[PDB]
Design a protein around this ligand. Structure first.
Ligand code: ATP
Ligand code: ATP
Lengths: 848, 240, 225, 160, 80
């Protein structure tokens, strides 16, 4: 019936009747209630409608006090007695005002009007309330922060604020700092999207939870910045004016206010220049309680450039939650997502979202993306309700097309002729569709209502819970008890009965095809893929199974080298399982012929394990001497030219932590590099010129070698046999220190492979070459016949250079020949292959 | 007189200077020895001067203009170099970091301001300790302030701890509230007559037991709070 | 390490030279490590001037960074490592470094590192050969630690490091002449690996056992695979 | 909601806040789930600013005010670097450039509009050719606009 | 370096720094100003030592500043 403000006043009014031991509550006591005390925040008294109207609040009070004296003081039994007929009238009139004003609860303001109308301080020294024009204007004007900030503690008080999870200490840490007499402003330090404002929301909750030290408990909490910093300016000082405004308004009336700044980096001070941030230290003792925020990276440069910030704000660190912590956050929000979207959610989808969101985001925060992955995927399911109009419209649309045919053909003369009277069949189809549509429609209506009611009950529960939580933290044991006294248990029972109405059926595990539910990783992987691209990673498979399926493709795609593939596969599986010591990245030595495809094996591994052949990072080890720096990992030492540290490899590794790195002809590397290699073969914390390590774990490092190529050339089996592969390893043992060999996951030996299968490569490349022409398909009559199969494998493919010369033969004997005849307009479409023993193309049109 | 004083209200060329000259005129006339001060004077002058106060002011190096400014090490060096005027118009005062003993004296001087703000008590050895710890462990923040950070932070730790004491009470009150609410549920029932919900009598033994603890825990709590407040208020009154 | 010993070490960068963040590896990181320890790997391979640079850390801890700034080394412990005296340590005079032997060791370091630096070291510590008499504790203790963490723990190996298992380690693992690091090598190459051959096939519900075969090698555990 | 909304429908200091917290307030309630949009799109960096929240956040929070925003790639980065609160309020959507096939399909759908515009016959192969040419001679210009401009310009030409 | 216009309007005149003895002469000329300023006497020898010593002391002050600084400072010190 009454607002918290009106209740405060009436509690006080009734209290005053008993404090002064009066025979009845009178308009005077309510006026006195309004004059609770001369508090700076005293809206009905110091900031009131009379003081800002016509008469001095101090004198008004004295009259009221005289009236409290004039109303007789009696014994406790005659004391207080009643609210009085006088106020039964005033308060009912206040209720009438509420209806006039469209407000559901009685405002203390409405009481002021009803009250004032009855009263009249007709002293010659009038204090009678200024009349209605001044009173009303000032009332309408009731309540810088309103234009530049959000009152987070009041939001929290009203509910409708996500519970903060996994930040309990960070919240307490800022509160502790705020309690400080000086330099009491904490600053949250960490990447954007890590929940740094979740902490602030959490503080808002602590304030309304009364967990906050009294000195801070009586304070408000606001979210600020941007509106008064980056939003816009025409002149010098436009932001600084707003700063001063807020910096000083905060010192008047409103007890104490804690502020929050979204980003310190935007403040800094523009070469100081009496601008932005420079105005904040000015009030670092001057109340101005504030929680700041910035990033670890910028923080260091902010402090180094500023010199004062670190003594104004405290360095409070905030970090991303682990996947499990993220899931806990998501679980707290799981039922919120369900009611927010009108869907159901599997717990395993939260697990998947957190795991997956982390894995695919080297450039984005986990809690941010996990929350979106879930809000998007469950929004997706909410959208899926389209199933109702999708099925009904596909059919109803046809029905309507049929109805159009019907009215179209009925309104004719040929309508009587069978020419159009066959239309009756259309009517049969109209009816047939209507017969399908009605049970579909009713199915959908039921399905909709099932979820709907479930959702509504959950929303009711949450609001009863919000009421209970407020009742409990504010010590309203009556409200809390009633909510716990079956109100909440009963809505829970209703929810359970609604689950009975969900009626999971054996044929439909929830009687609602509109609500597909957020189904584990199917819904989540789909969502992530829709948002980021579609990797193998989308699959609900173990690391070993994803790998194994890909290993089988790898074995099929690479010609021969199966032994090599298996050696790699074994080591990778060991590593994927976590059994290999995690400190060590997998690494291999690919030993074979130049031109053997060793590079491609590694690229395919990248193509599979990291789902992208082009993520391959490569090192020329032959063009290498004692100065090995930028072209590698180390860079030159900073303090020496060559700032692009590890410009070639480190950069790719640090921006592609999940990849493959090659050492091309590593046996030619300078000996000092080889000792670096030992470092590189284990303990992934590989050094660099800046002092930052690599932390190579998920990057496979593959060294390659032609050291034993001559033994491979022996052709001792299509898969290399004993006495041959043992000699390439012999050469490895002679060249490489055992120390290197003792770190490498495996020495991998490749085989020589004849044209019996290399021809497959040739064909694959030819297919790629024609298919990759994005703008056309003037396909060859690819009359390679045996002559091109061998020409390409004889004057092309080389035992020393593999496909490199195939590509060149094709470019010159096919594409360049083709280009010319295209320009001659001798091709309208397609073209004829005509190998003439070297190679050429015949012109398909007759030189047309 | 700086920062907000200067540019928060300066939009057009001439607004800063108007505000500033307005003040210079006022301070140079009638009102006894007005002395002004500036904190980080590095803010003044600007990258090419263009008179950010520093070109107007020198006249008054003869014509009064008493101002106490402040700066540090190298920013000082760079502005002195770029300036060459203010440089000559004031006395360089090196301000050395106080000794640890002086720092403790400072901490002692401020002890009641910490105790009053926070509503806590501290040990004298705490003051000694903060000065010494700061000397030993915070070589990037000079003593007075570093030691005070330890004091203020420590006091805040305690103030929070004080305010966290209701948690002991709440562990008992939460059980109590779960109990009185559950009793309402057990009692206002039909199964209330059944022995099924008669367990509420045990729940009542427990709410009573919790109240038996909470009463003296709360009397204690309130008195302890009073001990803090009466000392706080007494010290406040004394200083006043 | 050469005269260049900049960001990656102590010299950092100075005005006039490439790079601003400076002294990165040691003095910058140390600036943000209020107490610490350091390790100097194969310190005898260091440039001799750098060996004397370390005197700034060795005592009166005012490292002079490229910017003229310092870290005030104080509440730290620094360990430098070398094998110059290995020729005397390897004298095998018991399992504890002996008189004279240790002096020859000090000779070797004083004839390499400037003695003006070495004499300022809190202590020069000579490691003893350990050999089987205590190496047999390294094995097994280290393995337990690996298994104590494992990953999911459920499938960890209950140790069966029989004397035969330890014999393999003694014969190949305990390379008292070259370092006993092969023990770690063998745990992974023989144990984690050969168990992996079955774990990777998902043949194990929980727990695990390793049996041994001589030509050191391991047996297949016929409970799985 | 634009142009007039931004400036042209007013002329005094303070009129922005008055028409803004006026039309938006009207929009915010009763008359359907109103979704608004901007045609000058980047314009939120000026039409929002101090009111970047007020333009939507509390109007959404108090009811159903929703908007469809837009920005170029550079402007997106700018609204994010400038404010970034928009990445809590809004959902970034990439918009594709059509293929020649798709472009032609678009042109074909609008072909009669173009024929009507100038009273000129248009060959189907001219939509194909214009799209192919636009990509080939102006690859850095929006394909469907360029293809169309080529056509509307040439249509206008022959009409003259 | 930027203008050139005013250069055709004005005559550039370098102003020399006075020697220590010349500086003393200024101190002597201003001596009565200083005695009046603070109501104190100052020794002629003080003016002399100030000028000489000031040179030794202040590399960042011209002789007339460094000397007048010591004199006005000393007079101020005495005024206390
Ligand atoms: N632990 C948590 N409990 C509740 N909500 C959380 C938690 N962590 C993150 N969130 C939510 O996830 C998001 C990440 O918040 P954060 O404050 O780091 O974003 P931000 O850095 O403010 O980005 P912005 O500047 O676009 O507002 C927030 O929207 C927050 O509501
Ligand atoms: N067994 C094979 N499997 C797959 N591809 C092969 C095989 N043998 C040869 N090739 C092809 O021939 C080429 C061999 O490439 P490889 O990288 O081994 O050459 P290289 O030794 O790197 O020296 P370069 O790049 O200069 O020829 C590849 O392009 C590959 O497609």
């Amino acid at each position: 019936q009454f607002t918290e403000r009106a209740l405060t006043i009436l509690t006080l009014a009734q209290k005053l009747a008993s404090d002064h031991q009066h025979p009845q509550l009178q308009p005077i006591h309510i006026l006195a209630a309004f004059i609770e005390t001369p508090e700076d925040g005293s809206v009905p008294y110091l900031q009131n409608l009379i003081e800002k109207g016509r008469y001095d609040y101090d004198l008004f009070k004295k009259v009221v006090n005289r009236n409290l004296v004039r109303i007789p003081q009696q014994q406790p039994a005659p004391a207080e007695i009643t609210p009085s007929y006088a106020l039964g009238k005033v308060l009912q009139d206040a209720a009438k005002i509420q209806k006039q004003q469209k407000d559901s609860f009685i405002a203390q303001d409405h009481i002021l009007f009803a009250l004032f109308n009855d009263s009249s301080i007709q002293q010659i020294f009038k204090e009678a309330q200024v009349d209605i024009e001044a009173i009303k204007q000032q009332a309408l004007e009731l309540r810088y922060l309103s234009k530049y900030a959000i009152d987070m503690t009041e939001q929290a008080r009203q509910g409708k604020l996500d519970p903060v999870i996994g930040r309990e200490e960070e919240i307490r840490s800022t509160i502790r700092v705020l309690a400080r007499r000086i330099k009491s402003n904490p600053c949250l330090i960490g990447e954007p999207g890590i929940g740094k404002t979740a902490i602030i929301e959490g503080v808002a909750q602590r304030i309304i939870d009364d967990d906050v030290p009294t000195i801070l408990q009586g304070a408000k909490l606001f979210s600020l910045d941007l509106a008064a910093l980056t939003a816009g300016a025409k002149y010098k000082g436009d932001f600084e004016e707003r700063f001063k405004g807020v910096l000083k308004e905060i010192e008047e009336s409103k007890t104490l206010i804690v502020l929050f700044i979204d980003e310190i980096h935007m403040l800094m001070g523009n070469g100081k220049d009496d601008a932005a941030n420079i105005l904040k230290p000015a009030l670092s003792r001057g109340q101005l309680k504030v929680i700041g925020a910035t990033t670890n990276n910028e923080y260091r440069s902010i402090v180094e450039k500023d010199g004062a910030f670190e003594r104004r704000f405290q360095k409070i660190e905030v970090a991303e939650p682990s996947v499990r912590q993220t899931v806990a956050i998501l679980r707290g929000l799981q039922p919120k997502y369900e009611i927010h979207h009108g869907v159901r959610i599997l717990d395993s989808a939260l697990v998947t979202a957190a795991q997956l969101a982390k894995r695919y985001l080297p450039y984005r925060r986990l809690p941010d993306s996990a929350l979106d992955l879930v809000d998007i995927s469950c929004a997706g399911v909410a959208v899926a309700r389209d199933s109702k109009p999708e099925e009904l419209d596909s059919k109803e649309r046809q029905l309507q097309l049929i109805q159009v045919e019907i009215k179209a053909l009925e309104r004719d003369e040929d309508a009587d002729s069978t020419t159009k009277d066959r239309l009756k069949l259309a009517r049969q189809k109209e009816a047939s569709l209507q017969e399908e549509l009605e049970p579909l429609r009713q199915r959908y209506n039921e399905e909709k209502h099932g979820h709907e009611e479930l959702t509504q009950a959950k929303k009711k529960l949450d609001e009863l819970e919000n009421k209970a939580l407020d009742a409990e933290r504010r010590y309203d044991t009556a409200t809390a008890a009633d909510l716990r006294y079956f109100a909440i248990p009963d809505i829970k029972k209703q929810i359970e009965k609604l689950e009975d109405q969900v009626a999971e059926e054996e044929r439909r595990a929830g009687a609602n095809s509109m609500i597909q539910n957020v189904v584990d990783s199917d819904t989540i992987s789909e969502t992530a893929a829709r948002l980021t691209g579609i990797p193998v990673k989308k699959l609900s498979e173990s690391e070993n199974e994803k790998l194994i399926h890909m290993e089988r493709d790898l074995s099929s795609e690479v010609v021969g080298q199966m032994d090599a593939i298996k050696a790699v596969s074994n080591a990778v599986r060991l590593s994927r399982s976590g059994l290999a010591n995690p400190r060590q990245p997998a690494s291999f030595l690919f030993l074979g012929l130049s031109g053997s495809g060793k590079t491609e094996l590694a690229k395919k591994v990248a193509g599979f394990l990291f789902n992208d052949e082009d993520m391959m990072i490569r090192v020329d080890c032959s063009e290498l001497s004692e100065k090995y720096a930028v072209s590698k990992l180390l860079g030159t030492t900073a303090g020496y030219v060559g700032y692009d540290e590890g410009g070639f490899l480190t950069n790719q590794l640090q921006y592609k932590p999940y990849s493959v790195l090659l050492f091309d002809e590593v046996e030619k590397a300078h000996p000092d590099v080889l000792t670096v290699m030992l470092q590189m073969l284990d303990d992934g914390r590989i050094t660099s010129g800046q002092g930052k390590t690599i932390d190579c774990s998920n990057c496979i490092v593959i060294m390659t070698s032609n050291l034993g190529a001559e033994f491979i050339n022996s052709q001792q089996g299509s898969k290399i046999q004993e006495s041959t592969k043992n000699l390439v390893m012999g050469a490895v043992r002679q060249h490489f220190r055992p120390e290197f060999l003792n770190r490498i996951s495996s020495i991998v030996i490749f085989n020589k492979l004849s044209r019996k299968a290399i021809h497959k490569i040739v064909d694959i490349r030819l297919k790629e070459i024609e298919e990759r022409f994005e703008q056309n398909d003037k396909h060859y009559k690819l009359n390679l016949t045996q002559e091109a199969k061998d020409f390409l494998a004889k004057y092309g493919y080389s035992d020393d250079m593999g496909a490199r010369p195939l590509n060149r033969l094709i470019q010159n004997e096919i594409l360049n020949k083709l280009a010319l005849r295209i320009l001659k307009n001798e091709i309208k479409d397609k073209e004829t292959v005509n190998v003439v023993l070297e190679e050429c193309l015949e012109v398909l049109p007759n030189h047309e």
